Amino acid sequence: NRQPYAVSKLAGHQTSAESWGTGRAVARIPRVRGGGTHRSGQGAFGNMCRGGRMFAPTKTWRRWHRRVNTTQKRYAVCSALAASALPALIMSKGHRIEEIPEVPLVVEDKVESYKKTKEAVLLLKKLKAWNDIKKVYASQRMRAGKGKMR
Amino acid sequence: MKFSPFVTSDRSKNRKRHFNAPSHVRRKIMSSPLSKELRQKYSVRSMPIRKDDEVQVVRGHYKGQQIGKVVQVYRKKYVIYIERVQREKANGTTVHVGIHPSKVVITRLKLDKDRKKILERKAKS
Amino acid sequence: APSRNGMILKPHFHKDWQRRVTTWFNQPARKIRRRKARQVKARLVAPRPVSGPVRPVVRCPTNRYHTKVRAGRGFSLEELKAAGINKKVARTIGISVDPRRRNKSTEGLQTNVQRLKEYRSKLIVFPRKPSAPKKGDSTAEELKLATQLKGPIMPIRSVYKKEKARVITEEEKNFKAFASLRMARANARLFGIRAKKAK
RNA sequence: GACUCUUAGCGGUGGAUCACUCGGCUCGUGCGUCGAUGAAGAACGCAGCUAGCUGCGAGAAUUAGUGUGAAUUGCAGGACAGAUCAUCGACACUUCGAACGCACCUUGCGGCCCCGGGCCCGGGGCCACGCCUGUCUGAGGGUCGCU
RNA sequence: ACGAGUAGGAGGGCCGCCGCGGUGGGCGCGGAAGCCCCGGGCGAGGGCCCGGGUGGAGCCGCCGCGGGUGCAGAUCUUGGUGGUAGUAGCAAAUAUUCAAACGAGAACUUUGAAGGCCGAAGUGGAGAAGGGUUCCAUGUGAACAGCAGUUGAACAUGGGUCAGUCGGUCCUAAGAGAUGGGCGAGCGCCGUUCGGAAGGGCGGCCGAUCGAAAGGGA
RNA sequence: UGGGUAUAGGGGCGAAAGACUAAUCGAACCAUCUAGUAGCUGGUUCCCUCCGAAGUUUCCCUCAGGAUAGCUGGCGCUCGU
RNA sequence: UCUUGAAACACGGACCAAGGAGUCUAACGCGCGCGCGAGUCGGAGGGACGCGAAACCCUGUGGCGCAAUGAAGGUGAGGGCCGGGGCGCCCCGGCUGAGGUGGGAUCCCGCCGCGCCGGCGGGCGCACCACCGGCCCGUCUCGCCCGCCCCGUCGGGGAGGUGGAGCGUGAGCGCGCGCGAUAGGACCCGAAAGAUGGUGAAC
RNA sequence: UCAGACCUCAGAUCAGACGCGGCGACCCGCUGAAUUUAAGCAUAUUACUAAGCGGAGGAAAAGAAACUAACCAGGAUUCCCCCAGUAACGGCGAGUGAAGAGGGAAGAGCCCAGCGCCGAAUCCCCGCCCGCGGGCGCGGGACGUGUGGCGUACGGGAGACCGGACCCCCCCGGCGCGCGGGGGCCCAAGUCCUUCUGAUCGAGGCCCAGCCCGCGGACGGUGUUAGGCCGGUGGCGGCCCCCGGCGCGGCGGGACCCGGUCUCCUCGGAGUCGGGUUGUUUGGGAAUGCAGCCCAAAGCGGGUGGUAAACUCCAUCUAAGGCUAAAUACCGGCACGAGACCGAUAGCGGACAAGUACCGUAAGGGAAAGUUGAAAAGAACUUUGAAGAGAGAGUUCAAGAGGGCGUGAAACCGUUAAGAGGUAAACGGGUGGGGUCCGUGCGGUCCGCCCGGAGGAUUCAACCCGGCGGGUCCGCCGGCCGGACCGGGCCACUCGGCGGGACGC
Ligand SMILES: [Mg+2]
Ligand SMILES: [Mg+2]
Ligand SMILES: [Mg+2]
Ligand SMILES: [Mg+2]
Ligand SMILES: [Mg+2]
Ligand SMILES: [Mg+2]
Ligand SMILES: [Mg+2]
Ligand SMILES: [Mg+2]
Ligand SMILES: [Mg+2]
Ligand SMILES: [Mg+2]
Ligand SMILES: [Mg+2]
Ligand SMILES: [Mg+2]
Ligand SMILES: [Mg+2]
Ligand SMILES: [Mg+2]
Ligand SMILES: [Mg+2]
Ligand SMILES: [Mg+2]
Ligand SMILES: [Mg+2]
Ligand SMILES: [Mg+2]
Ligand SMILES: [Mg+2]
Ligand SMILES: [Mg+2]
Ligand SMILES: [Mg+2]
Ligand SMILES: [Mg+2]
Ligand SMILES: [Mg+2]
Ligand SMILES: [Mg+2]
Ligand SMILES: [Mg+2]
Ligand SMILES: [Mg+2]
Ligand SMILES: [Mg+2]
Ligand SMILES: [Mg+2]
Ligand SMILES: [Mg+2]
Ligand SMILES: [Mg+2]
Ligand SMILES: [Mg+2]
Ligand SMILES: [Mg+2]
Ligand SMILES: [Mg+2]
Ligand SMILES: [Mg+2]
Ligand SMILES: [Mg+2]
Ligand SMILES: [Mg+2]
Ligand SMILES: [Mg+2]
Ligand SMILES: [Mg+2]
Ligand SMILES: [Mg+2]
């Protein structure tokens, strides 16, 4: 489900920088052509140079997607459903089921015709599953990192 | 949640569209809630701020119960000036302190031909 | 460059291949685009089926596939003539016409003639003007039970019929299958060299 | 104890680090529209106070129309009672540029028509090349006819 | 029982960094991240926890997941700062001195006087090319003018270039360059007479046009 | 000697020095091909535990390099014990 | 850091901060993990229907395996026991479904010394390995039988050597992880050059 | 020809149109390298690539078979999958490399010339007249050196006969009548209580349902961290003004007879195919395509049939004329949505007056540079100095935020505090001294269980009693549930290269 990310192809290479060769007491790195600019005489291509090209620029044709066998994809569901029937695994997951009627919580099909949130909120209060919703409210916080800018 | 593909949830797009909003859009953004007496009289919750409107500051340092009339609506700064909400500079001259419209409640509306037309549309729906 | 036991590989990356690399990141959006286009095309031809005209049953050419059948381009003009359908009227009622296809046998000829006579039995021809029907137009009672057909018209299926079990005769037991094949190859290989000796 | 060395506090130099982000990159989607009716680009000019940016064209920091409905704001002002903004179907849109009277390192040099003023001055409209159809004026015993 | 190790291989990490799915009814203006510490510690180590100070809004543990994930070197890149060092230096073309004025302030400005230099192939008076407001007046003394400056070609605010007869404009010089024609896949190129080339008043011209602020030119 | 013109890069120009052709000339300058290639130099970033070398064989327009055998490590496995 | 040898009169390093070098895609091999298993995988497309460009479902065309071998025409992988018969050296019937020798984890039995524990006595022997048969394809030598509607330059089989990446009651396939050798800028930085197009006679 | 016509060729600032340049990501036609690989290098490769030139469009191009195949036959083009790193090519070295079939996306087919029938039956222009089209001209032309209708290889035409059409259909305009966009104005609920803060968006609370709304708990702004303050979000939500379609009706103007049999008649593209040769290209190899030159066709012909050639058989198509949507491509542009991406030495060169400053004669080269505070509240006033620059005062939560101002590391430097100092300084190991801190001497420096004794306080304990609860994962029960389980009935059942079998309800 993830989108491809890649650095531009022209990053660090849209400049005509030629190495000064040896004999100039410089480090044999491609330097920018001369001028009345502070950019003149600076490395432009190597990854160690400021404003250059990163090492191995990320390509968009990276293999983002993985294919799984249908038999294994169905296997994992049969195991995740079987694990949703054990009280120890649901509590160890963190859900608040210490007061629900039965661990496999089957309700009548009348709840499939609900049309208001207050009806669904009341159903969770009757099934004693509202303590898990309040636990979601207690977990509503702010992410730590650059995800906030994304 | 937001399901329309025509509306954006990007923080940068919503912040850019806010700080670069035109004047007629900043008017809608710089709205303020009506008082309990006005929200029940006109059945309108909030109205865009107006010059001759009287408001009460509900948040900040200048909050209280003193009803003050707005003296300037500075849409370029996203802030309004009230007749008594002010402070004295170093040289003694007084200067108004900017208060955000969402921090004041409208106690009296400058009702003209255009103000009553908006109160009728907002209450009709 | 080589090492212990391995495979001599042939990497075809001696050109500027990175300049021409087509990624399929628009494949899911392409699946929605074609799905949406079929829904718009279905509303265009509302009573008519969404797949289009009728394709005939054709035999695949090569020995690798001459046992199965598939859907051809259009019905031959000989099949249209045997089914009593004009070459130009057929395309108006959603019948694919292929003026190029031949009929070397009557098995494939009568295969589509039956398929072409069966499709016209399922046709519900609306009148050109709804206020005045004509001879070829279906009755108003039949025009009500007329819905848009989804999928290909008359899907081509090859239901295998069982060969009836029978007691093996002595002629079938005495038939030399291996000898009849080796001698068939010799008689087909030495056919020309024996035809000269006869002159 | 001057100097020197180490450590620490504080103060400098310097800018790291962290936090911030109206930016970039990548992916996806829908459109996919320039120009002799003067394009792209360029020049110059335009604001009460205005250099750059940006927006405009002598109607020049915008006009009209329409929507919106009290601001713009650095400051002054009364223009301003439909303010302001957005939109944009009206109008306008200097010079150079395919650039088109001839030229251009020149605000150079012309021609035609019409109008106004006193041949001169001013204004307006025109004068590139290639080519299509038609028109008009022609050309050559080129092929005929009539003399 | 055993314990060296370069090149190299392998495993372990409750070592560290960024981001994601989970999870801790986590943490935080009663103070997060970062930073400093002659503070207390822990681990063999990578590192980590706590305290104080500073800071002002985010941040972290655990199970998995994705890497642009760990620096002392590359005459690395960018930025900053040292010793050198208050050192080299402020030494080509003879030379200044006195008094006064303005001014907070004078070896350097201004006025006066004296002594000198350039000595008419000038250190004089005017142009061309180039520069483009450097020109002029007033004001500033902050940065610049490698000392200073009350001064300036600096800075700030205003002002200043007036033509029939000076030049451009006009003419062709070497040239350059269209038209016809030719070539060329093509942008185009070759070519300067070579084609029904006279737009005038009976016409000859033979080559449009451009090309001189030192040529020609009322 | 000024100005105006002419000749442009494998070309120009040269009373000839491989001189000169914008501080660049035994082949200018600019951008691209281009992150050209390099058996050749330089560098190559956290800790710990365990094992631990080779400069020798054969072949190679090889002899500053590879291929191969040896030495190394990892993964085991078949048994015994 | 290169080196047989560096504290070297060998090279780089004045100082601090940030940046800075084994990557990604394709394909191959082995090891490992997972799924199914003589199968295996939808990797095109189709269909259900904020995150959802996900997930779900269908589709096996096809790929890789299940058969190899020869240049090709082509051809193409069953062993053993029992009885009868032929006695040369390979016919028939029946019961079965991969043989024989040596080794072989494990299992089974007897006996003994104490329904357990040690002695030596056998047996069914996994996988694997050594060896010997057997069969398939190529090829060679020696050959005497056989088959038929298309009786011929026809097609079949035997015996004994030998070539093959074979058979001998399948093990692959999909996915992921790691390493190794590659081709791609390919760990990073570096040439002297070469090419295409263009700009300069203000020196 | 009342003497001029025609042909050919000119002129015009003639009447009315068109072409030019830009962009060029994708696309079409040409042109064309070398780095590089082959461990050298020359063919090869790089590559039918870059650079160079021309031409378009929203797509282009291609496209209705002179095809594939050898079958029991397929049937325009484009694209995807597969064929396949295969056939083949190649100093057969390095390397290169498709197609038929098969599965999908999308599917749409057509028009001429020629041939012969029709009184040129055809068309443009001007003027006038009607509602960009129409009539009108005894208007001017084009055209027989060939316009229009019919008609194109799937055959076609004509005449008969037969069966069906015939104000209908079909096409173009706009009217009645209901569905894709564009632009506007709106559309649910705390600023409740307590408390912290410079500022709440913090923390706690808000009768029984946990304050309220929730088809709205996306996001942003607001002086902190907000579903309920605000803009919005949600909603087959409302309203208003436009735009573009489609369906159903009628109105106006234009088209307009189709099929089936027989007979009769008719039927095709030339300096092109092809052969030779050359160069180039291709996997195409005694030549895949393309082109130059020479040769130069045929009409039971011609092309193809992946090895040159002759004879023969067979299959297949009908070249040398044209048009044509969809699936497809898109690094440019315009407008959007998104991110396991980057977070100011990073990400585009460019988060800023960035292709800017600046450099070069030019072609071109090309930076650095984001952050006061919540709010300028930006420090009045006093005083020293000529002034910068200070001292008070003042603003603010904070000046330890004072205009390149958030945080403010290191190198380096000033200064203070401590210690030390003639084998450059630093370093390991061991200890000593000093210093700064930390934890300790508080009525010192001991706890826990049990027991003995003392002292006072008990919802006072064992046992018994009635009901309750749990355990026996203790014996009798009884249900329920699962099947490689058994025997009987019944199903829209399903199921298989067999009404029965099997499966399950
Ligand atoms: Mg470049
Ligand atoms: Mg970069
Ligand atoms: Mg962080
Ligand atoms: Mg190796
Ligand atoms: Mg400091
Ligand atoms: Mg990262
Ligand atoms: Mg890195
Ligand atoms: Mg460093
Ligand atoms: Mg002056
Ligand atoms: Mg002055
Ligand atoms: Mg000075
Ligand atoms: Mg100045
Ligand atoms: Mg002139
Ligand atoms: Mg002169
Ligand atoms: Mg000269
Ligand atoms: Mg060149
Ligand atoms: Mg010499
Ligand atoms: Mg060790
Ligand atoms: Mg050795
Ligand atoms: Mg060496
Ligand atoms: Mg020495
Ligand atoms: Mg060295
Ligand atoms: Mg050094
Ligand atoms: Mg670093
Ligand atoms: Mg054995
Ligand atoms: Mg290997
Ligand atoms: Mg070369
Ligand atoms: Mg063009
Ligand atoms: Mg080479
Ligand atoms: Mg090499
Ligand atoms: Mg190109
Ligand atoms: Mg399209
Ligand atoms: Mg086209
Ligand atoms: Mg090739
Ligand atoms: Mg919020
Ligand atoms: Mg609201
Ligand atoms: Mg080639
Ligand atoms: Mg695009
Ligand atoms: Mg940057």
Coordinates of C-alpha atoms (C1' of nucleotides) in Angstrom, one line a residue, chain H residues 23-364:
Chain H
rC23 C1' 6.6 24.8 -27.1
rG24 C1' 8.7 20.0 -28.4
rA25 C1' 7.5 15.4 -22.0
rC26 C1' 5.0 11.9 -25.3
rC27 C1' 4.8 11.2 -31.2
rC28 C1' 6.3 11.2 -36.9
rG29 C1' 10.3 11.6 -40.9
rC30 C1' 15.8 12.1 -41.5
rU31 C1' 20.7 12.5 -39.8
rG32 C1' 24.5 10.5 -36.8
rA33 C1' 29.1 9.8 -33.1
rA34 C1' 32.6 8.4 -29.7
rU35 C1' 33.6 7.4 -24.9
rU36 C1' 32.5 2.2 -23.3
rU37 C1' 32.7 -3.6 -23.7
rA38 C1' 35.7 -7.1 -26.2
rA39 C1' 40.7 -7.0 -19.9
rG40 C1' 44.8 -4.8 -26.4
rC41 C1' 42.3 -3.7 -31.0
rA42 C1' 40.3 -3.2 -36.5
rU43 C1' 34.4 -6.2 -37.6
rA44 C1' 31.3 -6.3 -33.4
rU45 C1' 29.5 -3.6 -29.2
rU46 C1' 28.2 1.0 -27.3
rA47 C1' 23.8 2.1 -30.9
rC48 C1' 20.1 2.0 -35.9
rU49 C1' 21.6 5.6 -29.0
rA50 C1' 23.3 11.0 -27.6
rA51 C1' 24.0 15.5 -30.1
rG52 C1' 22.1 17.9 -35.2
rC53 C1' 17.6 19.0 -38.8
rG54 C1' 12.5 18.9 -40.3
rG55 C1' 6.9 18.0 -39.0
rA56 C1' 2.6 17.7 -36.0
rG57 C1' -1.5 16.3 -32.3
rG58 C1' -4.0 15.9 -27.4
rA59 C1' -2.5 11.9 -28.5
rA60 C1' 0.6 10.7 -32.6
rA61 C1' 1.8 6.8 -35.5
rA62 C1' -0.1 2.3 -37.3
rG63 C1' -4.6 0.2 -39.2
rA64 C1' -8.8 -3.1 -42.7
rA65 C1' -4.2 -8.2 -45.2
rA66 C1' 0.3 -9.0 -52.5
rC67 C1' -0.9 -11.8 -43.5
rU68 C1' -0.1 -16.0 -40.7
rA69 C1' 0.0 -20.9 -41.3
rA70 C1' 0.8 -26.0 -43.1
rC71 C1' -3.5 -26.8 -39.0
rC72 C1' -9.8 -30.1 -37.6
rA73 C1' -6.9 -23.8 -39.6
rG74 C1' -6.4 -18.6 -38.3
rG75 C1' -8.3 -13.2 -39.8
rA76 C1' -7.2 -4.9 -39.6
rU77 C1' -4.1 -2.0 -36.2
rU78 C1' -2.2 -0.6 -31.2
rC79 C1' -1.1 -2.2 -26.1
rC80 C1' -0.3 -6.0 -22.0
rC81 C1' 1.0 -11.3 -20.7
rC82 C1' 3.4 -15.4 -22.8
rC83 C1' 6.3 -17.3 -26.6
rA84 C1' 12.0 -16.2 -24.8
rG85 C1' 16.9 -14.6 -23.4
rU86 C1' 14.2 -19.1 -27.4
rA87 C1' 14.8 -19.6 -33.3
rA88 C1' 18.5 -17.0 -35.2
rC89 C1' 22.8 -13.3 -35.5
rG90 C1' 28.0 -12.7 -34.0
rG91 C1' 36.7 -11.9 -34.6
rC92 C1' 30.0 -18.1 -33.6
rG93 C1' 34.5 -14.2 -29.2
rA94 C1' 32.4 -10.3 -26.2
rG95 C1' 27.6 -9.8 -26.9
rU96 C1' 22.9 -9.3 -29.6
rG97 C1' 17.9 -11.2 -30.6
rA98 C1' 12.6 -11.2 -32.5
rA99 C1' 7.9 -13.7 -34.6
rG100 C1' 3.5 -17.4 -35.6
rA101 C1' 0.3 -19.6 -32.3
rG102 C1' -2.0 -19.1 -27.3
rG103 C1' -4.4 -15.6 -23.0
rG104 C1' -6.3 -10.6 -22.4
rA105 C1' -7.4 -4.7 -23.1
rA106 C1' -10.1 -2.5 -26.9
rG107 C1' -12.9 -3.6 -31.1
rA108 C1' -15.5 -0.4 -36.6
rG109 C1' -15.0 -0.6 -40.4
rC110 C1' -14.7 2.2 -45.1
rC111 C1' -13.6 5.5 -49.7
rC112 C1' -11.6 6.2 -54.6
rA113 C1' -9.0 5.9 -59.8
rG114 C1' -9.9 2.5 -63.6
rC115 C1' -14.4 -0.3 -66.2
rG116 C1' -19.8 1.6 -68.3
rC117 C1' -24.7 3.7 -67.5
rC118 C1' -27.0 8.7 -66.4
rG119 C1' -28.7 15.5 -71.6
rA120 C1' -22.1 18.2 -66.4
rA121 C1' -27.0 15.6 -64.1
rU122 C1' -21.2 18.7 -60.5
rC123 C1' -18.6 23.0 -58.1
rC124 C1' -16.7 28.0 -56.7
rC125 C1' -17.4 33.4 -56.6
rC126 C1' -20.2 38.2 -56.7
rG127 C1' -24.6 40.8 -56.0
rC128 C1' -29.5 40.7 -54.3
rC129 C1' -33.1 38.5 -51.1
rC130 C1' -34.6 35.4 -46.9
rG131 C1' -33.7 32.9 -41.4
rC132 C1' -23.7 30.9 -40.5
rG133 C1' -26.8 28.3 -43.7
rG134 C1' -30.6 29.0 -47.8
rG135 C1' -33.2 30.3 -52.4
rC136 C1' -32.6 34.0 -57.1
rG137 C1' -29.3 35.9 -61.4
rC138 C1' -31.1 36.0 -69.4
rG139 C1' -24.5 37.1 -63.1
rG140 C1' -19.2 35.9 -63.6
rG141 C1' -16.2 31.3 -63.7
rA142 C1' -14.1 26.3 -62.9
rC143 C1' -14.9 21.6 -65.6
rG144 C1' -15.3 17.1 -71.3
rU145 C1' -6.9 17.2 -70.7
rG146 C1' -13.6 14.5 -66.9
rU147 C1' -17.3 17.1 -62.0
rG148 C1' -21.4 14.5 -59.7
rG149 C1' -24.6 9.9 -58.9
rC150 C1' -24.2 4.2 -59.0
rG151 C1' -20.1 1.2 -57.9
rU152 C1' -14.3 -1.3 -55.3
rA153 C1' -12.7 -7.3 -55.0
rC154 C1' -16.5 -9.2 -49.1
rG155 C1' -17.4 -8.8 -56.1
rG156 C1' -20.3 -5.1 -59.0
rG157 C1' -23.9 -3.4 -62.6
rA158 C1' -28.3 -4.0 -65.8
rG159 C1' -32.9 -6.4 -67.2
rA160 C1' -36.9 -9.7 -65.6
rC161 C1' -39.6 -12.3 -61.6
rC162 C1' -40.7 -12.5 -56.5
rG163 C1' -41.1 -10.7 -51.3
rG164 C1' -41.2 -6.4 -48.5
rA165 C1' -40.7 -0.4 -48.0
rC166 C1' -42.7 4.1 -49.4
rC167 C1' -46.0 11.8 -44.9
rC168 C1' -42.1 6.1 -41.5
rC169 C1' -37.0 5.4 -40.8
rC170 C1' -32.0 8.6 -41.6
rC171 C1' -29.5 13.7 -41.1
rC172 C1' -29.2 18.9 -39.4
rG173 C1' -31.3 23.0 -36.4
rG174 C1' -33.5 24.5 -32.2
rC175 C1' -38.6 23.6 -28.6
rG176 C1' -41.3 21.1 -25.3
rC177 C1' -39.8 17.5 -20.7
rG178 C1' -36.3 14.7 -16.8
rC179 C1' -28.5 13.8 -15.6
rG180 C1' -22.6 15.2 -15.8
rG181 C1' -19.9 19.7 -14.6
rG182 C1' -18.6 25.3 -13.3
rG183 C1' -19.1 29.4 -9.8
rG184 C1' -21.4 31.4 -5.3
rC185 C1' -24.3 31.6 -0.2
rC186 C1' -25.3 28.5 3.8
rC187 C1' -26.1 23.7 6.6
rA188 C1' -24.8 19.6 14.4
rA189 C1' -22.9 20.0 19.0
rG190 C1' -19.2 23.2 26.2
rU191 C1' -15.8 28.3 25.7
rC192 C1' -20.4 24.2 31.7
rC193 C1' -17.8 23.5 36.9
rU194 C1' -12.9 23.2 39.7
rU195 C1' -7.7 23.8 39.0
rC196 C1' -2.8 24.8 36.7
rU197 C1' -0.8 28.6 33.0
rG198 C1' 2.0 34.7 30.3
rA199 C1' -1.9 32.4 27.4
rU200 C1' -5.4 26.3 28.0
rC201 C1' -6.3 23.6 23.2
rG202 C1' -3.6 21.0 30.0
rA203 C1' -5.5 18.1 34.3
rG204 C1' -10.3 16.5 37.0
rG205 C1' -15.6 16.7 36.8
rC206 C1' -20.3 17.1 34.1
rC207 C1' -28.2 12.1 38.0
rC208 C1' -29.7 7.1 36.3
rA209 C1' -26.9 6.4 29.1
rG210 C1' -20.2 8.3 30.7
rC211 C1' -21.8 16.8 29.3
rC212 C1' -23.4 17.4 24.2
rC213 C1' -23.3 16.3 18.6
rG214 C1' -21.9 12.4 15.6
rC215 C1' -23.8 9.8 8.0
rG216 C1' -19.8 15.4 11.3
rG217 C1' -13.6 12.0 16.4
rA218 C1' -10.3 14.5 8.3
rC219 C1' -7.3 18.8 8.5
rG220 C1' -6.2 24.0 9.7
rG221 C1' -6.6 28.4 12.4
rU222 C1' -7.2 30.3 17.2
rG223 C1' -1.7 33.3 22.8
rU224 C1' -0.3 25.3 24.8
rU225 C1' -2.2 19.3 23.2
rA226 C1' -9.9 21.5 20.7
rG227 C1' -15.3 16.5 17.6
rG228 C1' -18.3 20.4 20.3
rC229 C1' -14.4 28.8 19.7
rC230 C1' -13.9 29.6 14.2
rG231 C1' -13.4 28.1 9.0
rG232 C1' -14.5 23.3 7.6
rU233 C1' -15.5 17.9 7.7
rG234 C1' -20.3 14.5 7.1
rG235 C1' -24.8 14.2 4.3
rC236 C1' -28.9 9.6 -3.4
rG237 C1' -28.1 18.3 2.2
rG238 C1' -30.6 22.9 0.7
rC239 C1' -30.6 27.4 -2.3
rC240 C1' -29.0 30.5 -6.5
rC241 C1' -26.6 31.6 -11.4
rC242 C1' -24.5 29.3 -15.7
rC243 C1' -22.3 25.3 -19.0
rG244 C1' -22.2 20.7 -21.7
rG245 C1' -24.9 16.1 -22.6
rC246 C1' -28.5 12.1 -22.9
rG247 C1' -33.6 10.1 -23.1
rC248 C1' -38.8 10.9 -24.4
rG249 C1' -42.4 13.9 -27.7
rG250 C1' -43.9 17.3 -31.4
rC251 C1' -42.2 21.4 -35.0
rG252 C1' -38.9 23.3 -39.2
rG253 C1' -35.5 22.2 -43.0
rG254 C1' -32.8 18.3 -45.6
rA255 C1' -31.8 12.8 -47.5
rC256 C1' -34.5 8.9 -49.5
rC257 C1' -37.1 2.3 -52.0
rC258 C1' -34.4 -1.8 -49.9
rG259 C1' -34.0 -7.5 -50.4
rG260 C1' -34.1 -12.8 -53.0
rU261 C1' -33.7 -15.6 -57.3
rC262 C1' -32.3 -16.5 -62.1
rU263 C1' -30.3 -15.1 -66.8
rC264 C1' -27.0 -11.1 -69.3
rC265 C1' -22.8 -8.2 -68.7
rU266 C1' -18.5 -6.3 -66.2
rC267 C1' -14.0 -6.3 -63.3
rG268 C1' -8.5 -2.8 -61.4
rG269 C1' -3.2 1.1 -59.8
rA270 C1' 4.4 0.8 -64.3
rG271 C1' 10.6 3.5 -64.4
rU272 C1' 6.2 -0.2 -60.4
rC273 C1' 6.9 -5.3 -59.5
rG274 C1' 11.0 -8.2 -60.4
rG275 C1' 16.5 -9.3 -61.6
rG276 C1' 21.6 -7.5 -61.1
rU277 C1' 24.8 -4.4 -58.1
rU278 C1' 26.2 -1.0 -54.2
rG279 C1' 25.8 1.0 -49.4
rU280 C1' 23.2 0.7 -45.0
rU281 C1' 19.9 -1.8 -41.7
rU282 C1' 18.0 -6.4 -39.3
rG283 C1' 17.7 -12.2 -35.2
rG284 C1' 16.6 -12.7 -40.8
rG285 C1' 21.4 -16.1 -42.0
rA286 C1' 23.2 -17.5 -51.4
rA287 C1' 20.7 -10.8 -49.0
rU288 C1' 14.8 -8.7 -43.2
rG289 C1' 13.8 -3.7 -44.5
rC290 C1' 15.4 0.9 -47.0
rA291 C1' 17.8 3.6 -50.8
rG292 C1' 21.3 4.9 -55.2
rC293 C1' 22.4 3.4 -60.3
rC294 C1' 21.6 -0.2 -64.5
rC295 C1' 18.2 -3.6 -66.5
rA296 C1' 13.1 -3.7 -66.8
rA297 C1' 7.7 -7.0 -66.4
rA298 C1' 3.5 -10.0 -66.9
rG299 C1' -2.3 -10.8 -66.9
rC300 C1' -4.8 -19.2 -65.9
rG301 C1' -0.9 -12.8 -64.0
rG302 C1' 1.9 -11.1 -59.9
rG303 C1' 3.7 -11.5 -54.6
rU304 C1' 4.6 -14.9 -50.4
rG305 C1' 5.6 -20.2 -48.7
rG306 C1' 12.8 -18.0 -43.4
rU307 C1' 18.8 -22.1 -48.2
rA308 C1' 20.7 -20.5 -54.0
rA309 C1' 18.5 -23.0 -58.6
rA310 C1' 15.3 -25.9 -62.5
rC311 C1' 10.7 -28.8 -63.2
rU312 C1' 6.0 -29.8 -60.9
rC313 C1' 2.0 -29.8 -57.4
rC314 C1' -0.4 -27.1 -53.6
rA315 C1' -1.7 -23.3 -50.1
rU316 C1' -2.5 -18.2 -49.4
rC317 C1' -3.1 -13.2 -50.6
rU318 C1' -4.2 -9.3 -54.7
rA319 C1' 1.2 -5.0 -54.2
rA320 C1' 2.8 -0.5 -56.8
rG321 C1' -4.2 4.8 -54.4
rG322 C1' -6.6 7.0 -49.9
rC323 C1' -9.5 7.4 -45.0
rU324 C1' -10.7 5.6 -40.1
rA325 C1' -12.4 6.0 -33.4
rA326 C1' -11.3 3.0 -28.9
rA327 C1' -7.5 0.1 -25.8
rU328 C1' -1.7 3.0 -25.8
rA329 C1' 2.4 7.1 -24.6
rC330 C1' 3.4 11.6 -21.9
rC331 C1' 10.1 14.0 -17.5
rG332 C1' 6.7 20.1 -21.0
rG333 C1' 2.3 22.9 -19.6
rC334 C1' -2.6 23.6 -16.7
rA335 C1' -5.4 21.9 -12.3
rC336 C1' -5.7 18.5 -8.3
rG337 C1' -5.1 14.2 -4.6
rA338 C1' -1.3 11.7 -2.0
rG339 C1' 3.6 10.0 0.7
rA340 C1' 6.9 3.9 5.7
rC341 C1' 10.3 10.5 1.0
rC342 C1' 13.8 15.3 2.3
rG343 C1' 13.6 18.7 6.8
rA344 C1' 17.5 24.8 5.5
rU345 C1' 25.5 21.9 4.2
rA346 C1' 19.2 18.1 3.4
rG347 C1' 15.1 18.3 -0.5
rC348 C1' 14.8 21.2 -7.1
rG349 C1' 20.3 25.6 -8.4
rG350 C1' 16.3 28.1 -6.2
rA351 C1' 11.4 27.2 1.3
rC352 C1' 13.8 34.4 0.9
rA353 C1' 13.6 40.8 -4.4
rA354 C1' 16.6 32.7 -7.8
rG355 C1' 18.0 31.6 -13.0
rU356 C1' 18.4 36.6 -8.5
rA357 C1' 23.3 38.8 -7.0
rC358 C1' 27.7 38.0 -9.4
rC359 C1' 31.4 36.3 -13.6
rG360 C1' 32.9 35.9 -18.7
rU361 C1' 33.6 39.6 -25.3
rA362 C1' 30.6 35.6 -26.0
rA363 C1' 28.4 30.6 -26.0
rG364 C1' 27.5 30.1 -20.8

